[PDB]
Write a protein that binds this ligand. Structure first.
Ligand code: SF4
Length: 209
């Protein structure tokens, strides 16, 4: 248990115990500056798991995943797909906010977790997957997609595709889609196109049998 977060992950599938243990994780350096660990949220009967990159500024203080503008956009997209809450477990590839500030900024600015951090934190993701046994996993953005599909995976090339990789416990369906935060910037028309495609991918996931 010498690698990354491995020794911090208890031998239990209980999400409450997992979240408590993740609160004490020192498996990479990100715990130092962040406020708290942000574990995933939902229950183990969920059939759809969603994985973002990391808790953001709001998530870091809320102690819950997907609470910012990007979570609100995600809510809009789940609505437009016909996805119910009880079906969902939502979490992040890295579970401590990695960040910096810029003078005059209105928020703390997220920084991209390195591959080393993603791999160090992945024992938690594996624990969550084995705990939840989802039918499908939605990977929201490149960091999360690469966490499970390989450092060379390209989200832009596999949109709407149902993927299956044989080193993911329980062989769930996998669907890689856009980083919802990316849909906050830019021309309305392209944000609307992007939103429709995210809904497309969520429907694809929700229809996995
Ligand atoms: S990011 Fe993941 S591995 Fe690094 S300290 Fe936080 S929980 Fe542990």
């Amino acid at each position: 248990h010498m690698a990354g977060a491995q020794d911090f992950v208890p031998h239990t599938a209980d999400l409450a115990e997992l979240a408590a243990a993740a609160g004490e994780c020192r498996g990479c350096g990100l715990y130092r500056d962040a406020t708290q660990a942000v574990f995933g949220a939902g229950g183990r009967s969920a059939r759809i798991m969603m994985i973002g990159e990391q808790p953001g500024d709001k998530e870091d203080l809320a102690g819950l995943p997907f609470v910012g503008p990007a979570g609100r956009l995600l809510d809009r997209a789940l609505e437009a797909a016909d996805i119910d809450r009880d079906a969902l477990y939502v979490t992040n590839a890295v579970k401590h906010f990695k960040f910096t500030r810029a003078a005059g900024g209105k928020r703390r600015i997220h920084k991209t977790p390195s591959r080393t951090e993603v791999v160090a934190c992945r024992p938690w993701l594996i624990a969550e997957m084995t705990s939840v046994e989802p039918d499908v996993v939605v990977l929201l953005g490149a960091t999360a997609a690469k966490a499970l599909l390989g450092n060379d995976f390209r989200v832009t090339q596999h949109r709407g595709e149902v993927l299956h990789v044989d080193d993911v416990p329980g062989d769930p369906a996998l669907v890689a889609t856009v980083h919802p935060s990316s849909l906050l910037r830019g021309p309305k028309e392209e944000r609307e196109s992007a939103f429709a495609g995210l809904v497309d991918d969520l429907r694809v996931a929700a229809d996995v049998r």
